[PDB]
Design a protein around this ligand. Structure first.
Ligand SMILES: [Fe+3]
Ligand SMILES: [Fe+3]
Ligand SMILES: [Mn+2]
Ligand SMILES: [Mn+2]
Lengths: 227, 227
């Protein structure tokens, strides 16, 4: 069976060792001869949101993605800094506004939502983001939508995880329910985890410091854990 | 958040080294102080379906489960032998009939389906099993149903996997659709994998030779990969 799309789902890189942990993964997938349509990094890109760490991340990852002709999709995590990421990763003017973005890969919509709260480890989605997201999803994409965020909308199966979890999930669920979101890609957790949120599959990739392969079929989305 | 149920999902033990790979996992979870309601083993219990290997498996696992007061749930895999498993694992009269079973854990239904084909590595579900399964699911369980089988009803993301995959999945899907099956537990693959089948979450546990924790919440089922 040939997939419609192939995505790479990497998370929690924590760059400031994390340098060659990520380095060796890149080449391992380069050497596997895999050619994904997109590489999605679901947060905690930089451990202390450092300019130097973003620069370094960009030099390591951009060549890798260009070779495979793959779209790079960056997501804000709790440890990141919105302004330094915009500045040193995206070549955009600095702003503390949520890193929310829409990205079409042929017929597939990828939506990047920012669940980060500046200077806080927990997760939240602000009213303006739910409005933005609702408006966007009112138009169905041909091959449906992948949602990429940091803090996963799933129950916390550990206590030291509850204080840093994504808050007010009911609001998100009200917006996602009945739309064309087919899968939710998330990070934060540091162990591979899957569940559903309002009927939608949630897949959380483990920390880098393995990752997930994502094959998008016409009728299903397959997530596989690569050690 | 307190889960309604906790399940342990272990797969592909391949006992005939596999002995102390499984041994060290048991104790690691014994030592974690985890107390699951059920331990579900999703096939390839014995590598050559050997009487000696079932005896050994039983001596290693039954004490472990009794301590935690956990229900043992055994599933036929491709490598198993229906008659020797019935004989040396279940203390049942030998039979080549599919190992199909229903098991209530308080309000939660667990259904064991046998996708094995004797002397063959591929997977199939026979007409009589679809009838049995349909009849059973006509009655909803209070806390819905977990389905446990060997060959997962998900697309094969590798070629050397297609010849051994579960065949005629459309038939299964016709039976599962709209019933109270909340999750499908599966094995066979040897890499952690999740997808949906007819809207239902499928979670495949990796080979032992790690496993999965399964927390069953009122509104969702969370699967986590334990290295
Ligand atoms: Fe992190
Ligand atoms: Fe196996
Ligand atoms: Mn995080
Ligand atoms: Mn198998």
């Amino acid at each position: 069976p040939r997939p419609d799309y192939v995505l790479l789902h990497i998370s929690d890189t924590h760059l400031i060792d994390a340098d060659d942990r990520l380095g060796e993964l890149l080449e391992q997938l380069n050497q596997s001869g895999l050619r994904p349509d997109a590489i999605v990094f679901t947060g905690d890109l930089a451990d202390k949101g450092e300019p130097a760490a973003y620069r370094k991340l960009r030099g390591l990852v951009e060549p890798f993605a260009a070779q495979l002709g793959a779209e790079l999709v960056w997501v804000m995590g709790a440890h990141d800094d919105r302004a330094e990421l915009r500045k040193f990763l995206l070549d955009e003017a600095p702003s503390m506004a949520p890193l929310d973005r829409v990205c079409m890969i042929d017929g597939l919509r990828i939506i990047v939502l920012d669940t980060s709260v500046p200077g806080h480890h927990h997760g939240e989605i602000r009213a303006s983001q739910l409005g933005w997201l609702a408006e966007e999803l009112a138009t169905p994409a041909p091959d449906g939508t992948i949602l990429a965020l940091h803090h996963p909308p799933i129950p916390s199966v550990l206590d030291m995880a509850v204080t840093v979890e994504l808050r007010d999930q009911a609001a998100l669920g009200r917006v996602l329910r009945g739309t064309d979101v087919r899968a939710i890609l998330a990070g934060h957790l540091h162990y591979s985890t899957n569940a559903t949120f309002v009927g939608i599959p949630v897949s959380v990739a483990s920390a880098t410091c393995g990752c997930n392969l994502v094959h998008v079929y016409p009728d299903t989305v397959v997530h596989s854990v690569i050690p």
